[PDB]
Design a protein around this ligand. Structure first.
Ligand SMILES: CCCCCCCCCCCCCCCCCC(=O)OC[C@H](COP(=O)([O-])OCC(O)COP(=O)([O-])OC[C@@H](COC(=O)CCCCCCCCCCCCCCCCC)OC(=O)CCCCCCCCCCCCCCCCC)OC(=O)CCCCCCCCCCCCCCCCC
Ligand SMILES: CCCCCCCCCCCCCCCCCC(=O)OC[C@H](COP(=O)([O-])OCC[N+](C)(C)C)OC(=O)CCCCCCCCCCCCCCCCC
Ligand SMILES: CCCCCCCCCCCCCCCCCC(=O)OC[C@H](COP(=O)([O-])OCC[N+](C)(C)C)OC(=O)CCCCCCCCCCCCCCCCC
Ligand SMILES: CCCCCCCCCCCCCCCCCC(=O)OC[C@H](COP(=O)([O-])OCC[N+](C)(C)C)OC(=O)CCCCCCCCCCCCCCCCC
Ligand SMILES: CCCCCCCCCCCCCCCCCC(=O)OC[C@H](COP(=O)([O-])OCC[N+](C)(C)C)OC(=O)CCCCCCCCCCCCCCCCC
Ligand SMILES: CCCCCCCCCCCCCCCCCC(=O)OC[C@H](COP(=O)(O)OCCN)OC(=O)CCCCCCCCCCCCCCCCC
Ligand SMILES: CCCCCCCCCCCCCCCCCC(=O)OC[C@H](COP(=O)(O)OCCN)OC(=O)CCCCCCCCCCCCCCCCC
Ligand SMILES: CCCCCCCCCCCC(=O)OC[C@H](COP(=O)([O-])O)OC(=O)CCCCCCCCCCC
Ligand SMILES: [Zn+2]
Lengths: 297, 161, 265, 165, 98, 55, 157, 75, 196
């Protein structure tokens, strides 16, 4: 009592208890209070939440910064590529221009990295001083507890408030996945394909307003860009019901089923598997498919 | 805004790194001079004034570091050092008691006087009695120090509560 | 190594430096009278060895971008002291180029330098001479602080029950998620924004601004840390053990003509 | 108990460290969430705001609303018109409420001394330098001790004590 | 402004206790000095006398240092700078008890 | 992974080496203890009351 | 009936930083303990919980790395380490330390683990009693952060 | 090695395993200490017994120590 | 005051040396676009970049409009244990059927040809380069190790090196005891010779 070797805060040892002990009456009260629940396979959740397009899981503002920096860099490319002189033939001049372009892009990549680092530093500051950015009652619950040690409701409220304290261009929210939204909404994929075709036609016109050799090179580039953009939005866009009906190979149908299962696992699986069952006489599979189209899809 | 470093007390440069050693050197040379010439090179009061003035730096730095640089890690370090210092003092007292009791526990002793019985009425309590040691006043001082200990413990606990 | 500085003023037979060294240490009459024994070959570049190592090389010496790199100022040191330097460097650069020409969106490049060596003693990780102030902002952080603690033993030490350590109530609530999405008419709740540890993926790579959106290219420099006292490497997903053993055998077989004519005495 | 003597858990190794019954209390909890071990026999009082001190050098860094929300009291006699609010343990938020009466501890000498150390003096990285003349005296004392030591060494060795010359 | 307040100083428990302890320590020192000069017959140049006097002199030196500590703590308590959890208070208490 | 727990890296001692080491150590201890505590003959006493001499 | 006011703790600076956010500072200065010999024996024979470890990606994969956070100055290399024996072939006698650039994917090729040591700077309000008692907005903080990024700020030593 | 003596004797069965192992370690420390003390005490008491025997067999017929050393009364 | 630095931008000092750019170290004074964009000149690369940038803008706008103006028909809330920050990942990295095995085998073959052997050769070069850096009298290269070192496992070492050594030590112990006792005293069990 004459000494005191305390610390700032004693360590916390969890109390485990266990799953709740709900009696029959409580069980019935709970079950009568639940909504119409559909239990989902882990595969369904996986395909819903898989990483498809946002490979690096970059937030919105990071993608916006990258696109803005690309615009600014392109607006400055002709000035940097203008007037270059070097002793050599055409190929040597081309390599010199390529090196100049590379230097330009490496210059612009550093400014983008600096800005990403600055915004990350702002957000690091937000975390480092949470009690100074919160109101009651969440302030004390952020003061006494770490993120893993908070209640789920208080944890969510604290994190949302801390995120919303920032300006709109610093809030760290994941960017939309184009492939994901296209895969789970048939109209969105149609709109994206229409946009791709419109841009292709406009670019073809612009090219046709240019001298000959550039026309051929740029038209090849446009074809490649359209093909790869379509394969990016929906790799399985060629598995149409017409193609399924036209396919009479078991191995080919299995490949189609695998490709669809990787992508979205939609009713095209019903079509492919029905056509596979008919070609092989799988009555059990046909019954399961009936059940699936009744319930799964 | 400031950048926060580790909890550890980084430390400051100070003049106490050489002032205290110079103070010890001064005291020991003062003793040597007093031994040699039997006189004081510098007045004892002036020497004690210098010694006191040198050591006023501790409370000032203590105040200004508690106001600014203190946390539980630093406090624990300081309290453990205090404990070790108390231990050293206890050992010093043990050594001096060893010095005192070395010739007293060893009962046999060659004495200038007689301590056998049946020769005089008082000889048989010559060796086992130093009857001038001011026992009554020693007990009074004991009472004073018990007062101090109990009062200080009471007040310490009272404020701590 | 050593930088001789001004060769001119140290070649003179009688010098203030030589006399001071004689008086205090480093020189003596044994060097003035018998230089062939106490100076001998001396320490310096070996022109003959550089020529031999240059002429033993294959056409890789022509196809390497070494002479334009920032380390081109060390050409003689590495040609002399690293037999087969140019062929190994050419393999290194072609490995980098083939990683660059991959079909993967993220190109990982291994980086190894003086910091790539672990140690059990902290003073071995600093540059010499050591900085005046070290560990100002706290000491190391152990990766093991991110592993699940020994819950059973922890409960047992305290005399707690710990029977149901592996039985936890299920949690299905909207209040427990901050990351909400709408995916084809489905509102998916999944995950909580944690902070700096959720943005490790983007902060580690740098984009190629000219690469289109449908064929991204990202550059990532993967650091490598090793103990150097282990004798066995485990790269994980980056390199399988069988491939590594194959590479070891091939490397030791090719880089043998550069090593067979020398003895280690 | 050796463990309890050396400030440990004691017989039960899952036990805590603080025993506020005999003066071993938690300073951190007291400073942050008030002395919740006096919670059963003490009660907050609920109903002169702090806005009167909005113009002072150190309290001007706060907003007007923040000081308006704070209600003060003389701190000596119970306001007979003030109700009593029960002090709830396990509640970390009641010590920070703005509805409870408080006392202006800004004229306390320790408060003034601290803020002067921060707002009333030029910041010196060395507390000894915070006092200019004392540092002068201390360095003078160091030089004096050096001279005294040199003179004593000179006198003792040569056998002449410098007083006759 | 920072102005010394005798009313608050005298209405503070730490100031009273430390001053009382310093006074009692001074009384003890004076009493012990009064028995070293005009009470005893043996000096520090004897067998038992030397050991006894070395012991009591060391104790008296420690008492002087403790008196200085109590005076310093009285000065700090008058100014109101000593709190309940003060390591200065802990050190003085432990030293006096020792 | 704790690689130094009792379940890992147990090397049985070959029988010949075990026998040799056991015999060697037993013989060493027996011989040393014998010659140190049982073969001490300089502690010799001669009981003879007829070798005394008184004037 | 009487009114009591407990004497507050007036100390500022490091102490007030500790008492403003006790969770973070305790995390920084809280000692954790490793297993003794008997505890290692008792842990090595505990069972896995479920068959997930046979399917999932372990903690320390190229896609699920071990992310750790230190405090310091931006760009300063981070000191991190193992306690040894993350692999059967890796040493376990003593802790093994590492110096790594911040915010980069590193791989330990002793154990095979990918980690993301990274730095968060402990920028905090000048603790002199002028700290804010109510929610603060992004303007004043914006100015202070801009100055720190452009020029730097003193250290609390 | 040092097997836990308390397990085959059923002592400290109400304690967690760590603290039971601590008690086992304490018991083993107690055992290891008592060995050398036992050896040396046995040797000392054997030496005293042998001295008594010698004084009995040498001063049996003596007239000066025939009743003290001879009988062993104050060996 | 000398040359005071202006600003506080990153400088390579003892505490920080930065993250090396291996691509620039290797591809020094050589273009990268002949590998990343084979067959295209600078103007074609810029035109392609502009076209793709506009297309990406359009697609992003479409996707955001879609996600922000769709009616919710279902709500998906994953199951997690209490106190757990995030749900366990439902994706497994182990092939389950034979078709997945063939797919992963093809991927492994490609990765081996195009991503693993490059890593192996880069690491071998790094090890040799570290040797060269420490060679020449600067460090202790060649003082031990090499390719001729005999590395033994714990079991092999203890069984074939440790136990025989202790066996020889024990035999030496007994033989030396007997020989030394004979040498000093001149007998084996009788202490000094010609004395007792
Ligand atoms: C390394 C040293 C490790 C062992 C000592 C640890 C600290 C002991 C407790 C202590 O310091 O209390 C502070 C004590 C106040 O403690 P507290 O926290 O207020 O309350 C007491 C506890 O609750 C604790 O109260 P408690 O209920 O545990 O009782 C204390 C316990 C433990 O006491 C002892 O072990 C005392 C040992 C000394 C010999 C006498 C006992 C044998 O005493 C006994 O069991 C025996 C009582 C006396 C019997 C006398 C006749 C026999 O203050 C002082 O004693 C002031 C003087 C300085 C004391 C020493 C400070 C540490 C420096 C090293 C000391 C090494 C020598 C041994 C200590 C005694 C002096 C010879
Ligand atoms: C809280 C701190 C308190 C400090 C004050 C002292 C506390 C009491 C305990 C102190 C123990 C340590 C110091 C004494 C040990 C040295 C004694 C000594 O001189 O031994 C040599 C003497 C022997 O001296 P000698 O026989 O060689 O010769 C004496 C000198 N001439 C040659 C002139 C005759 O005693 C011993 O060796 C005895 C065995 C050692 C153990 C002694 C234990 C003493 C226990 C005292 C119990 C009562 C204490 C309270 C009253
Ligand atoms: C038997 C001796 C054990 C070791 C010495 C006692 C010790 O370390 O006490 C620590 C303890 C405090 O150590 P502590 O800080 O580890 O204990 C507090 C633990 N928590 C944080 C969980 C509350 O000190 C005391 O109890 C008083 C001081 C004892 C040490 C006196 C100086 C000894 C110098 C020589 C060694
Ligand atoms: C440097 C420290 C400060 C200056 C020196 C102080 C110590 C001087 C010791 C000699 C004193 C002699 C003297 O005059 O005594 C008079 C007095 C009294 O001498 P007296 O008892 O002979 O006087 C005669 C008294 N009547 C009338 C009864 C005949 O001596 C004492 O009180 C004894 C004090 C001894 C010192 C005890 C403290 C410890 C000393 C340092 C130990 C350090 C150990 C660790 C390092
Ligand atoms: C004598 C040998 C001393 C050896 C070392 C002892 C170490 C004790 C450390 C105590 C400590 O750190 O306490 C912290 C405490 C402070 O605890 P704190 O760290 O909580 O500080 C709180 C500060 N306030 C109260 C303002 C909020 O400080 C002290 O106890 C004061 C410093 C020590 C005493 C200084 C005395 C100065 C006066 C002159 C002395 C010289 C006299 C010369 C002789 C005169 C003869 C007539
Ligand atoms: C045998 C003879 C000697 C016997 C006695 C010595 C015993 C052995 C040695 C003991 C250790 C002595 C170490 C040397 C001490 C010399 C004095 C010294 O270092 O003074 C430093 C002091 C600094 O003062 P400060 O307040 O820090 O100011 C900084 C700038 N304003 O500045 C000053 O005090 C003023 C400047 C002093 C400069 C050095 C002396 C000339
Ligand atoms: C905290 C500290 C407290 C203070 C310390 C207190 C003492 C510490 C420990 C004391 C014990 C030490 C060892 C005691 C054993 C030796 C004494 C003994 O046993 O003596 C018996 C024997 C006497 O016989 P002796 O008189 O020589 O012959 C008469 C007719 N033959 O003796 C002899 O023969 C003496 C000649 C040999 C001397 C060398 C060593 C002999 C030791 C063992 C002798 C007995 C053998 C038994 C063991 C078997 C060995 C194989
Ligand atoms: C550099 C070290 C010098 C110090 C000497 C230490 C020697 C230690 C050798 C111990 C060998 C050993 O592992 O003992 C275990 C075996 C029992 O075999 P198992 O139960 O392990 O299968 O038990 C046995 O095999 C019985 C033999 C034990 C006799 C003791 C060793 C004799 C050598 C003395 C050398 C001075
Ligand atoms: Zn590891």
């Amino acid at each position: 009592s004459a000494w005191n070797f305390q610390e700032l805060m004693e360590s916390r040892i969890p109390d485990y208890k266990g799953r709740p002990n709900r009696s029959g009456a409580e069980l019935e009260q709970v079950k009568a209070a639940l909504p119409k629940i559909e239990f989902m396979t882990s595969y369904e959740f996986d395909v819903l939440t898989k990483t498809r397009s946002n490979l690096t899981k970059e937030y919105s503002y990071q993608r916006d910064m990258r696109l803005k920096v690309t615009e600014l860099m392109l607006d400055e490319a002709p000035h940097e590529l203008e007037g270059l002189a070097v002793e050599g033939d055409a190929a040597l001049k081309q390599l010199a221009e390529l090196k100049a372009l590379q230097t330009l892009t490496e210059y612009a990549g550093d400014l983008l990295e600096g800005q990403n680092q600055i915004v990350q530093r702002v957000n690091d500051f937000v975390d480092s001083n949470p009690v100074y950015l919160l109101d009651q009652p969440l302030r004390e619950e952020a003061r006494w507890n770490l993120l893993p040690e908070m209640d789920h409701k208080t944890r969510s409220l604290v994190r949302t408030e801390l995120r919303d304290w920032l300006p709109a261009e610093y809030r760290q929210t994941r960017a939309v996945d184009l492939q994901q939204v296209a895969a789970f909404s048939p109209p969105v994929k149609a709109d994206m394909f229409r946009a791709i075709e419109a841009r292709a036609k406009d670019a073809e016109a612009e090219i046709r307003s240019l001298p000959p050799a550039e026309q051929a090179g740029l038209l090849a580039l446009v074809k490649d860009n359209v093909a790869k953009s379509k394969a990016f939005i929906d790799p399985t866009y060629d598995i149409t019901p017409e193609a399924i009906n036209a396919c009479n190979d078991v191995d080919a149908l299995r490949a189609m089923a695998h490709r669809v299962t990787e992508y979205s696992g939609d009713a095209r699986l019903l079509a492919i598997y029905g056509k596979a069952a008919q070609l092989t006489g799988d009555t059990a599979a046909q019954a399961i498919l009936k059940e699936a189209k009744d319930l799964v899809f | 805004m400031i950048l926060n470093t580790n909890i550890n007390y980084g430390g400051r440069n100070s003049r106490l790194c050489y002032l205290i050693p110079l103070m010890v050197h001064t005291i020991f040379l003062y003793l040597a001079y007093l031994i040699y010439y039997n006189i004081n090179l510098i007045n004892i009061y002036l020497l004690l004034i210098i010694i006191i003035f040198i050591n006023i730096e501790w409370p000032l730095v203590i105040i200004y570091e508690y106001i600014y640089l203190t946390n539980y890690n630093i406090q624990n370090n300081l309290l453990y050092n205090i404990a070790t210092f108390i231990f050293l003092e206890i050992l010093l007292f043990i050594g001096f008691y060893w010095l005192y009791i070395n010739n007293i526990i060893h009962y046999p002793n060659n004495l200038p006087y007689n301590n056998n019985i049946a020769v005089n009425l008082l000889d048989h309590l010559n060796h086992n009695n130093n009857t001038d040691i001011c026992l009554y006043i020693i007990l009074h001082n004991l009472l004073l120090l018990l007062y101090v200990t109990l009062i200080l413990q009471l007040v310490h606990r009272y404020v701590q509560l | 190594g050593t930088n001789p500085g001004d060769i001119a003023l140290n070649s003179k037979r009688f010098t203030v430096g030589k006399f001071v060294a004689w008086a205090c240490g480093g020189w003596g009459l044994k060097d003035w009278i018998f230089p062939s024994l106490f100076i001998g070959r001396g320490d310096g570049p070996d022109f003959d060895r550089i020529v031999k190592h240059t002429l033993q090389s294959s056409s890789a010496i022509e196809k390497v971008n070494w002479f334009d790199s920032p380390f081109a100022c060390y050409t003689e040191w590495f040609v002399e002291h690293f037999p087969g330097f140019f062929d190994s460097r050419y393999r290194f650069e072609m490995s980098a180029k083939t990683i660059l020409a991959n079909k993967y969106p993220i190109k990982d490049f291994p980086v190894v330098d003086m910091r790539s060596w672990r140690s059990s003693r902290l003073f071995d990780l600093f540059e010499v001479p050591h900085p005046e102030h070290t560990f100002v902002f706290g000491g190391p952080v152990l990766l093991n602080t991110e592993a699940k603690r020994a819950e059973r033993l922890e409960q047992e030490w305290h005399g707690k029950d710990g029977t149901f350590v592996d039985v936890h109530p299920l949690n299905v609530a909207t209040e427990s998620h901050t990351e909400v999405s709408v995916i084809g008419g489905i509102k998916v709740y999944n995950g909580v924004w944690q902070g700096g540890k959720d943005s490790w993926k983007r902060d580690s790579a740098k984009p190629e601004l000219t690469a289109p959106f449908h064929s991204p290219i990202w550059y990532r420099n993967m650091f490598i840390v090793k103990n150097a006292d282990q004798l066995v490497e485990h790269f994980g997903e980056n390199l399988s053990d069988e491939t590594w053993q194959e590479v070891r055998k091939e490397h030791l077989a090719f880089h043998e003509r550069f090593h067979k004519d020398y003895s280690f005495a | 108990m050796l463990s309890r003597l050396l400030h440990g858990p004691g017989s039960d190794k899952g036990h805590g460290y603080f025993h506020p019954d005999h003066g071993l209390v938690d300073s951190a909890a007291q400073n942050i969430r008030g002395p919740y071990w006096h919670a059963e026999n003490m009660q907050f009082m609920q109903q002169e705001t702090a806005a009167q001190s909005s113009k002072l050098p150190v309290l001007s860094a706060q907003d007007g609303k923040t000081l308006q929300k704070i209600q003060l009291t003389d701190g000596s006699k119970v306001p007979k018109a003030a109700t009593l609010v029960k002090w709830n343990p396990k509640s970390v938020h009641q010590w920070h409420s703005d509805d409870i009466l408080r006392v202006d501890m800004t004229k306390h000498p320790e408060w003034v001394r601290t803020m002067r150390m921060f707002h009333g003096t030029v910041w010196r990285h060395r507390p000894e330098f915070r006092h200019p003349w004392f540092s002068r005296g201390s360095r003078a004392s160091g030089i004096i001790m050096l001279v005294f030591g040199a003179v004593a060494y000179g006198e003792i060795t040569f056998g002449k004590r410098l007083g006759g010359v | 402004p920072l102005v010394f307040d005798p009313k608050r100083a005298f209405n503070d428990e730490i100031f009273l206790c430390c001053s009382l302890c310093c006074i009692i320590f001074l009384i003890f020192l004076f009493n012990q000095y009064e028995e070293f000069a005009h009470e005893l017959s043996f000096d520090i140049r004897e067998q038992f006398g030397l050991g006894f006097y070395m012991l009591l002199g060391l104790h008296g030196s420690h008492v002087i240092f403790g008196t200085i500590m109590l005076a310093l703590l009285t000065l700090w308590g008058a100014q109101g700078s000593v709190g309940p959890q003060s390591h200065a208070l802990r050190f003085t208490s432990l030293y006096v008890h020792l | 992974y704790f690689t130094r727990v009792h379940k890992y890296n147990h090397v049985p001692v070959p029988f010949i080496l075990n026998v040799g080491m056991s015999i060697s150590i037993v013989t060493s201890f027996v011989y040393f203890t014998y010659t140190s505590l049982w073969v001490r003959p300089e502690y010799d006493r001669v009981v003879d009351p007829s070798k005394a001499y008184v004037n | 009936d009487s009114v009591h006011v407990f004497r507050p703790e007036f100390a500022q600076g490091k102490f007030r930083i500790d008492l403003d956010q006790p969770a973070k500072q305790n995390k920084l200065q809280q000692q954790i303990y490793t297993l003794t010999d008997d505890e290692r024996e008792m842990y090595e024979d505990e069972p896995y919980i479920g068959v997930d470890h046979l399917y999932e990606a372990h903690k320390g994969s190229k896609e699920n790395p071990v992310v750790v956070e230190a405090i310091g100055v931006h760009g300063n290399d981070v000191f991190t380490g193992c306690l040894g024996g993350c692999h059967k072939d890796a040493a376990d006698a003593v802790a093994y330390y590492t110096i790594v650039p911040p915010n980069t994917l590193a791989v330990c090729i002793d154990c095979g683990i990918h980690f993301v040591a990274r730095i968060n700077e402990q920028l905090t309000f000048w603790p002199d009693g002028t700290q804010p008692w109510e929610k603060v907005d992004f303007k004043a903080v914006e100015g202070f952060l801009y100055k720190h990024y452009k020029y730097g700020s003193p250290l609390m030593i | 090695v040092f097997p836990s003596i308390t397990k085959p004797l059923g002592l400290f069965k109400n304690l967690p395993r760590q603290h039971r192992a601590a008690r086992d370690a304490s018991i083993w420390l107690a055992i290891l200490t008592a060995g050398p003390f036992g050896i040396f005490i046995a040797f000392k008491y054997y030496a005293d017994w042998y001295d008594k025997k010698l004084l009995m067999e040498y001063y049996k017929d003596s007239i000066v120590y025939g009743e003290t050393y001879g009988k062993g009364k104050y060996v | 005051l000398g040359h005071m630095r202006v600003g506080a931008l990153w400088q390579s000092n003892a505490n920080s040396r930065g993250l090396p750019n291996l691509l620039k170290e290797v591809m020094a004074a050589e273009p990268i676009y002949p590998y990343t964009h084979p067959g295209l000149s600078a103007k074609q690369i810029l035109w392609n970049t502009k076209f793709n940038l506009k297309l990406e803008k359009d697609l992003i706008s479409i996707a955001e409009s879609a996600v922000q103006s769709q009616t919710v028909n279902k709500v998906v809330i994953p199951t997690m244990l209490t106190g757990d920050v995030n749900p366990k990942s439902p994706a497994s990295v182990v092939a389950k059927d034979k078709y997945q095995l063939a797919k992963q085998m093809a991927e492994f073959q490609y990765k081996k040809s195009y991503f693993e052997k490059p890593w192996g050769y880069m690491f071998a070069y790094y090890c040799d380069e570290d040797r060269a850096r420490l060679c020449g009298g600067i460090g202790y290269v060649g003082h031990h190790g090499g390719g001729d070192a005999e590395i033994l496992s714990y079991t092999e070492y203890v069984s074939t090196v440790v136990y025989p050594t202790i066996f020889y030590m024990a035999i030496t112990f007994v033989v030396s005891l007997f020989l030394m006792y004979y040498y000093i005293y001149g007998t084996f069990f009788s202490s000094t010779r010609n004395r007792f």
